[model samples]
Target: TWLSDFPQAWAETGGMGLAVRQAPLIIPLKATSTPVSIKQYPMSQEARLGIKPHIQRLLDQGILVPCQSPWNTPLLPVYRPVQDLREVNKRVEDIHPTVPNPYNLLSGLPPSHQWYTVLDLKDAFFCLRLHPTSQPLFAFEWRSGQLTWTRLPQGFKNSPTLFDEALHRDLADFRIQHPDLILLQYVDDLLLAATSELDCQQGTRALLQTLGNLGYRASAKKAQICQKQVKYLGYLLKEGQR
Candidate 1:
């Protein structure tokens, strides 16, 4: 149940060795209150105001189900700090991960080079609105009396799933138009890879235009196009590997 003296034992032994033990132990907690929050983004006043209309649109289109958390846990906002960035960079270095440098990967390929595009949606989680029908389900009490979420709030464990589903539906519709384009959707991120630059550019433009039409604006700062390799979902994607 717990590790005891393991830290000291590890320090005493060689730093690069493994040990095995067959007994389980219980460790008493020094403190009784440690809170866990799982939200990726915190809600801002402006974002809260936009959620209602967005939720209504999704519900009208039947893109999401009206539901609430079965568990009575308060949502806690999660933010990625500088330490997280360092950790990600360390992992990348360990694998000798290649950057998405288009120049090198396109060097020896045919005149028509293969291209990959990545799109990151702006304020993805905060951009959504809660369904009016299910808004009451999110009622919670703070120091103040009863309060309900008017917009989709971050920090809830299920928020990602809900956001992903809504985005997936919109992407599915976009895919139908360009049946030949290879498209991948991960939550609010979109990936498009193609055999030729023309196709890639066309696909990227179409996707951007489509998303704009849907009232979801892509972040120009985060969107990238026509790259030979891209690191997505914690792995390097290259010519032979995706």
Candidate 2:
């Protein structure tokens, strides 16, 4: 309810309209861009009922677009997620630089932070755009029409790796500017911890501002700021105990 007060950061539709990027993703290709065609799996009564909404929401956000490509993959309703695509794209992800789990980064941190901040980027994967050339690879049939993801799809293996690199590059300056604060990131998850509330507040403000400047958005629901104990990367981070 309080989020409505911050229009720049929140909205009724929940989209902060993160700034779009100029360049598309660099999808590494070993072979020529061959188009594959496939249709969506049949849905049940319940699935058919909700499929439109999920797709409409995505369409409203411009995350999905009509696919004119010869490529296609079967679409499954929200409840029935397809795992096959991950395997199909896993090889692509394998060649990319992977983001390391930053769990050990918190080990040296003192467990006595007076205040700390934990935040996850909103729609972290959708924040970036997929190359037009590669969009066809994610195409699927919907209602006799073809559709594809304009941004990185969730099931794709390399999505996290791409986001990690982008976020790291965006926050590089902030890290250099604030050596006193313990700012760690694993993909889009972020933690800013300090022994004093004042330090924590400063770090949080700097972090938020930096992310905004980078055209990134944070989810308030996933954010716990100005708190002594917080959750970071599935661990309960309290004064460094977790």
Best by TM-score: 2
lDDT of each: 0.47, 0.70
**Top lDDT hit:** 2
Candidate 2's displacement at residue 160, Å, is 0.6
How many collisions per candidate? 3, 5
Tens-digit per-residue lDDT, 8-65, candidate 2:
4422334544545436786774464344455556777787666777787888888889
RMSD of 2: 2.9
Q: What local lDDT does model 2 show for residue 45?
A: 75
Off by over 4 Å in 2: 1-7, 10-14, 17-22, 79-84, 90-93, 108-114
In model 1, what is the error at residue 47, expressed in angstroms? Answer: 20
- Candidate 2 lands at a TM-score of 0.85
